[PDB]
């Protein structure tokens, strides 16, 4: 029907089924097919469902339209349309009751969770193997106690009429309604208030939440068991018309026939007083038959004749890649469409495409019919059909009137990102292929290798106007993933423009003088002066530094004839120094980009067209071919290979004498072949790039070459140094598929021949790369599918949330070069707070403005290192994202409008380039200030600097204050310098030992042995070839039971032998000793201030991004600190080693367990702040969230995923990854109960908690306390309020079972739901629809 709100779901009562149906099927036969009338009371019928033909009795009595409503008596068939055959249900009244298969085997077992009874027991009740007891009463036995035949017989001896024990589905049906619901809830609530054990509280909170949701619905525990089973309207499972004889049956019809045969046989056996064994067996057969009908997968049994495939049950018509969500309710086939192969056609403009004439007559047939019947050239529709099937000459003029302003959508099939479908205007072509403008071809990522494209037609008025405004190809220049133009001129235009704008030192007409650029053109056409000969010309140029107008300026510049020709298509704005250089690929790309920045939109489009036209024209007049004498072999290749063979023979002889081992032999050979390959490549590149010597009109000079493939590489059209390296120099080192890299490299190039073995070796890398591509495609597609499932319901919905939180951005520095500066990251995001000038108390930026480009430069000039800026993850708006929390939009210019469905474009921007992926001393480098962060150090006796703080960090600074470089300075290392010591570059400023942990002291004196007994705790090991016998101290577990209860310790004393206190505190720090602690300076030996007491020895591709957005737990994570306090070890081997951290003021209830196998960092007297590392390794983000706050997990995810995308040169803006992070941490647990109705262990979406706390804080009550969860993206999709949006995604079965038990109700808000139903989307245009509806509802 129409005008309906939210969809409601619940269980279905038997009386509801009798309210549905229109008759009772009794006979299992479909049709007689002697005559093809349907059999009465079969699966097909006419009295039950409806008329076979239109408006006719099956008897054939009433055949007139004016007899509607009155049924026949010859056939009992209501004279109605055959659409009624699509819509009337049927019912079957079963003999025995029957268990539903989903509620038994969803696995959370709904019956088993409800009755508190294990699943296997209920299974061997339902399949007739046991008994249950139903109100035994004055009986030894209990209720849920189950038996066998022997205990049942012995009970019949004992309590022969007391207990009531049944079996089969009737017994479970008896147990279900015998149970109350209120008493179980109140009893188990009192029991949960009388329980402290955790797992019992888990199970009981599950059971009472099940019961409370089950009572707050409408339904009952009787309804999980079927009694009356409904059947589908028989047009919806149609009988296949074959050719000759019989009709081919579907799967549903065979399953219903089997069920009805079994039901009739059981009903007759009940009619004749059958013995008990046979009716038990028959009820088991009927239960198994209904379990085969509803879902064939739990018992994979029903297979048909001549095709041993599982038949398609009703649940198989919903799941999978062919059920009604993925197949038919999202991707529908569409009329007015078409398909062809494509073809270039370089004469087009940017906003049009080539359309075949005949196919365009075929598409627009109704518009043609309307134009013909308008102009009087026809009267009926059949006259118009005859005229357009004759293809008379008036029809082509009519078709050209139909085209003129009516755009057409074009599409390429594996659509990744939102530039995949675009709208053009048509230009008619007598042909059979679709022409397509060549600049757009990079955006589609189209070949011309046979790639096919498709055509759709917008046909209403709003669709034409949207395809003109929102989607015409003159409106998509910048990319939504990053603000870069997608209209880069490709390979051939690059070659043309690079060949035009060069120079050579002696040509025709060199050094003459010219008037305009057009006289240089007239000299090029006549053949008087060549295309590139240097010449002084006169140029006028316009500069718009005047505030909104143009300033002329005329001068004489030393330039080239080709550059003067190219200047004629540059518009008024740009300065002449944009076309004075050699103009490769990136140069003309930034030419287009600066033309977009300074002038606007329309000169950018028309300038890209003029560039494409003249680039193809002069690429034609070049004649740049390629030939076998354009690949210059070096003259020095032969002796380099000879010297490499001499060196490998010498290393082979040094291995043969036995001096060098095999691994170092391997390493020397691979190093010298790497060096030889690099030398040959250097020689060939130096021989190609500059060999061209030409006569000056003096003697000789040098210049950049005019060789063919060097122009094809130096312009950046096709190829790199690597491909042109393999063509003439030798090719690399081929690696075998085991993972090793082979000894002998391929000594030959491609211009010479390869022999048999070397080609056979190269085949390995070929097939490896091909298989990698073949699997990488599918994995990227699946990950894109899941991300756009997650982020779909999120729309920029209001203007200004108006908060004062956010994040702090600093330009990222690994320690090598600064990877991303502050300009590129925080271009175009709205400032959180007023970042002050380095001139203090001077407002450099207002707190609530937008960092546009000029403003970004004026922020850059004062060398700001950290800017605070508003993110999406802290935006305040319920059910959406505020506008100023998201900033300016990519692919357009200004701030984002209210409605842009940013979650979908974000998921596409992450998931689009997924195909391109794959599947001992600190040394400063420049001069600046030396800053050490979290440093607490002391100079020892030997002048070295040992640090008593773990978290020391190195910052190389300039004179300004911005960070030049950064490194990590370990705890207590060998430091060549101190803090703030102004040093210069190239300096190794630090060192340490990777096999010695610092057990450094704090005072001077002696070190004495407390509980360090040789034979109990410590051992005396003599280094047998040096002479310094030392002591080795283990931990408690590695030594035996003689020192297991003992704790060895190096007690820090003075030279007298007494504990000198730490300067600042009053605590003696005796040093208890961990394992592998080699104590060198023993008792009686004087120590220093912080001296080494004990020496202690110790992915990346696409699945990294997959395992990160799943947020799955890494192996052996890093233990953090829960709250600050003094560390204290405790009891050993109660599973693990205990640890108690005592706060300064609060108590210490948490006594954390640590596997003593894994190592540790902190010491006993040491105390650390919360969230700090204990055992090194990977980290799960759960801990990062619950300890370091909310922004920390966003920064961790952004930096890691952005490292994986910076490794391949892929540039993706950060706000997309932020708005994917927001949809991951939306659920929440509750810590208290609060003052409202929320339970404690209640998982609940955060925004409802936030509006509940806002409503309670409006009054004077107390709120609730919540811990923000963090789920995987598939777990976040699969737990959503809309039960449609979780049904369309994977595991539809479990979602429909849980949603049908709970009886939910889906508001239809979001994108995916309204696509399913088929009204306007609440995202784009139609957003302005929905709130216009919403104010209609509330008022």
């Amino acid at each position: 029907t129409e005008e309906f709100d939210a969809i409601k779901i619940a269980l279905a009562s038997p009386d509801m089924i009798r309210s549905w149906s229109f008759g009772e099927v009794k006979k299992p036969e479909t049709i007689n097919y002697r005559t093809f009338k349907p059999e009465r009371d079969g699966l097909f019928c006419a009295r039950i469902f409806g008329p076979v033909k239109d408006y006719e009795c099956l008897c054939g009595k009433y055949k007139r339209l004016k007899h509607r409503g009155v049924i026949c008596e010859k056939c009992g068939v209501e004279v109605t349309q055959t659409k009624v055959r699509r819509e009337r249900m049927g019912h079957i009244e079963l003999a025995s009751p029957t268990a539903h298969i989903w509620f038994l085997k969803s696995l959370p077992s709904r019956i088993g969770l409800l009755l508190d009874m294990p699943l296997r027991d209920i299974e061997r009740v339902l399949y007739f193997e046991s008994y249950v007891v139903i109100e035994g009463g004055m009986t030894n036995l209990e209720r849920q106690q189950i038996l066998t035949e022997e205990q049942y017989l012995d009970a019949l001896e004992e309590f022969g009429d007391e207990f009531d024990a049944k079996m089969g589905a009737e017994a479970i049906q008896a147990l279900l309604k015998s149970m109350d619901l209120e008493q179980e809830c109140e009893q188990l609530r009192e029991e949960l208030n009388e329980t402290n054990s955790e797992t019992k509280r888990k199970k009981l909170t599950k059971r009472i939440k099940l019961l409370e949701a089950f009572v707050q619905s409408g339904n009952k525990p009787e309804w999980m068991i079927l009694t009356v089973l409904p059947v589908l309207p028989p047009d919806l499972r149609p009988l296949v018309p074959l050719d000759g004889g019989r009709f081919a049956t579907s799967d549903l019809n065979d399953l219903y026939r089997r069920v009805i045969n079994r039901n009739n046989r059981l009903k007759r056996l009940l009619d004749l007083a059958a013995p008990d064994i046979i009716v038990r067996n028959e009820k088991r057969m009927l239960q198994e038959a209904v379990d085969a009908l509803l879902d064939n997968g739990r018992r994979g049994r029903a297979i048909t004749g001549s095709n041993k495939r599982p038949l398609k049950s009703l649940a198989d018509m919903i799941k999978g890649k062919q059920g009604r969500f993925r197949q038919n309710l999202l991707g529908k086939r569409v009329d007015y469409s078409g398909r062809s192969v494509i073809t270039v056609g370089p004469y087009l403009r940017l906003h049009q495409c080539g359309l075949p004439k005949k196919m365009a007559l075929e598409l627009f047939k109704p518009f043609i019919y309307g134009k013909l019947e308008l102009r009087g050239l026809a009267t009926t529709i059949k006259a118009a059909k005859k005229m357009v099937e004759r293809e008379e000459a008036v029809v082509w003029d009519i078709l050209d009137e139909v085209i003129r302003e009516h755009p057409v959508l074009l599409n390429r099939a594996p659509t990744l990102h939102r530039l995949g479908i675009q709208a053009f205007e048509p230009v008619l072509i007598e042909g059979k292929a679709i022409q397509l403008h060549p600049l757009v071809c990079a955006a589609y990522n189209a070949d011309f290798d046979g790639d096919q494209m498709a055509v759709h037609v917008p046909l209403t008025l709003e669709a034409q106007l949207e395809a003109r405004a929102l989607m015409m190809s003159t409106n998509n220049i910048l990319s939504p993933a990053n603000g870069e133009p997608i209209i880069v001129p490709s390979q051939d235009v690059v070659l043309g423009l690079y060949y035009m704008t060069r120079d050579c030192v002696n040509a025709k007409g060199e050094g003459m003088v010219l008037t305009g650029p057009k006289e240089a053109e007239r000299l090029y056409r006549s053949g008087l002066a060549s295309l590139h000969a240097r010449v002084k010309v006169r140029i006028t140029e316009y500069e718009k530094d005047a505030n909104g107008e143009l300033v002329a300026k005329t001068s004489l510049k030393d330039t080239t004839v080709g550059r003067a020709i190219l200047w004629m298509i540059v518009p008024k704005g740009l300065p002449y120094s944009i076309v004075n250089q050699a103009l490769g690929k990136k140069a003309i790309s930034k030419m287009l980009n600066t033309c977009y920045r300074i002038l606007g939109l329309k000169p950018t489009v028309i300038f890209a067209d003029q560039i494409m036209y003249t680039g193809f024209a002069y690429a034609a007049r070049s004649g740049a071919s390629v030939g076998i004498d354009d690949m210059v072999i070096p003259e020095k290749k032969h002796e380099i290979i000879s010297e490499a063979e001499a060196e490998v023979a010498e290393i082979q002889e040094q291995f043969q004498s036995g001096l060098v081992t095999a691994g170092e032999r391997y390493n020397k050979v691979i190093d010298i072949w790497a060096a030889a390959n690099d030398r040959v490549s250097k020689a060939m590149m130096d021989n190609l790039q500059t060999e061209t010597v030409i006569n000056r009109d003096g003697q000789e000079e040098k210049q950049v070459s005019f060789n063919s493939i060097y122009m094809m590489a130096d312009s950046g059209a096709r190829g790199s140094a690597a491909q042109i390296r393999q063509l003439a120099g030798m090719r690399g080192l081929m690696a075998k598929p085991d993972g090793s890299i082979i000894e002998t490299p391929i000594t030959a190039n491609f211009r010479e021949g390869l022999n048999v073995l070397q080609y056979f070796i190269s085949t390995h890398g070929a097939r490896k790369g091909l298989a990698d591509t073949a699997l990488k495609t599918a994995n990227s597609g699946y990950l894109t599918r899941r991300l756009v499932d997650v982020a779909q319901d999120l729309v920029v919905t209001e203007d200004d949330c108006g908060t004062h939180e956010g994040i702090m951005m600093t330009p990222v520095i690994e320690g090598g070069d600064v990877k991303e500066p502050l300009r590129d990251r925080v271009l175009g995001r709205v400032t959180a707070e007023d970042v002050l000038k380095p001139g203090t108390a001077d407002i450099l930026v207002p707190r609530n403005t937008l960092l546009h480009e000029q403003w970004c430069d004026l922020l850059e000039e004062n060398s700001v290192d950290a800017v605070k800026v508003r993110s999406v993850v802290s935006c305040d708006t319920d059910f959406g994202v505020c506008a100023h929390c998201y900033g300016r939009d990519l692919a357009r210019g200004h701030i984002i409008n209210k409605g842009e469905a940013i979650g979908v474009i974000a998921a596409q921007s992450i998931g689009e380039p997924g195909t391109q992926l794959t599947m001992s001393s600190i040394q400063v480098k420049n001069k600046g200030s030396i800053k050490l962060s979290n440093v607490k150090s002391v100079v020892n006796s030997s002048g070295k600097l040992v640090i008593t703080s773990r978290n020391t960090e190195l910052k190389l600074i300039d004179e300004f204050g911005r960070t030049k470089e950064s490194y990590k300075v370990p705890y207590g290392a060998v430091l060549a310098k101190g803090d703030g010591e102004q040093v210069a570059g190239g300096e190794t400023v630090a060192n340490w030992d990777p096999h010695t942990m610092p057990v450094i002291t704090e005072v001077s004196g002696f070190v004495r042995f407390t509980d360090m007994i040789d034979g109990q705790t410590i051992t005396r090991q003599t280094d047998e070839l040096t002479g310094l016998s030392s002591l080795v101290v283990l931990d408690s577990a590695e030594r035996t039971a003689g020192g297991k209860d003992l704790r060895p310790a190096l007690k820090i004393v003075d030279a007298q032998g007494n504990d000198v206190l730490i300067p600042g505190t009053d605590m003696p720090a005796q040093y208890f000793l961990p394992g592998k602690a080699i104590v060198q300076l023993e008792d009686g030996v004087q120590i220093s201030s912080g001296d080494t007491l004990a020496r202690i020895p110790q992915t990346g591709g696409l699945p990294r991004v997959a395992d990160l957005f799943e947020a799955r737990r890494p192996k052996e994570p890093a233990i953090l600190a829960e709250i600050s306090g003094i560390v204290s070890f405790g009891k050993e081997t109660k599973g693990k080693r205990r640890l108690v951290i005592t706060p300064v003021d609060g108590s210490d209830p948490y006594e954390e367990m640590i596997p003593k196998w894994r190592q540790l960092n902190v010491f006993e007297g040491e105390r650390v702040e919360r969230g700090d590392v204990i055992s090194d390794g990977p980290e799960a983000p759960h801990d990062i969230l619950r300890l370091r706050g909310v922004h920390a997990v966003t920064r961790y995810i952004v930096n890691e995923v952005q490292d994986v995308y910076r490794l391949q040169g892929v540039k993706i803006n950060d706000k997309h990854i932020e708005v994917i992070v927001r949809q991951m941490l939306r659920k929440a647990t509750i810590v208290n109960a609060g003052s409202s109705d929320f339970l404690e262990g209640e998982q609940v979406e955060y925004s409802r908690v936030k509006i509940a706390n806002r409503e309670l804080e409006a009054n004077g009550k107390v709120g609730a306390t919540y811990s923000r969860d963090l789920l995987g993206i598939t777990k976040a999709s699969l737990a959503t309020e809309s039960f449609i949006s979780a049904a369309s995604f994977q595991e539809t079965t479990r979602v429909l079972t849980e949603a049908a038990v709970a009886g939910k109700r889906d508001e239809l808000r979001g994108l995916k739901e309204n696509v399913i139903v088929g009204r306007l989307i609440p995202a784009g245009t139609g957003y302005a629809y929905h709130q216009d509806r919403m104010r209609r509802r509330a008022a």
Partner: protein, 98 residues
């Protein structure tokens, strides 16, 4: 291969696929993500409802084009009623409120 108005399937009232059976193209799922990614709203409504699965909607649209008036009639897709009728074939009540 092209199509203006051709044949339809039996179970769901969608057009067929292929060249030989005079079919229309599969405007699949990822293209729906792409139209959601623009601000395109009405065009998604035609590609979902007027071009297929709304019977009275599409015949009203065809007559309305031949008459020379570009309107549309939204309606409700027949495949969704199919989905309702085979969820009701299980034991699951599912209705539409209001």
């Amino acid at each position: 291969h092209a199509r203006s108005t051709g044949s339809y399937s039996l179970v769901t009232q969608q057009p067929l696929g292929g060249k030989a059976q005079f079919g229309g193209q599969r405007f699949g799922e990822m293209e729906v993500w792409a139209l959601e990614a623009y601000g395109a709203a009405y065009t998604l409504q035609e590609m979902l409802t007027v071009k297929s699965d709304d019977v009275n909607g599409r015949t009203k649209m065809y007559k309305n084009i031949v008459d020379g008036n570009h309107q549309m009639e939204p309606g409700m897709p027949e495949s969704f009623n199919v989905l309702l009728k085979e969820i009701r074939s299980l034991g699951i009540n599912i209705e539409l409120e209001d």
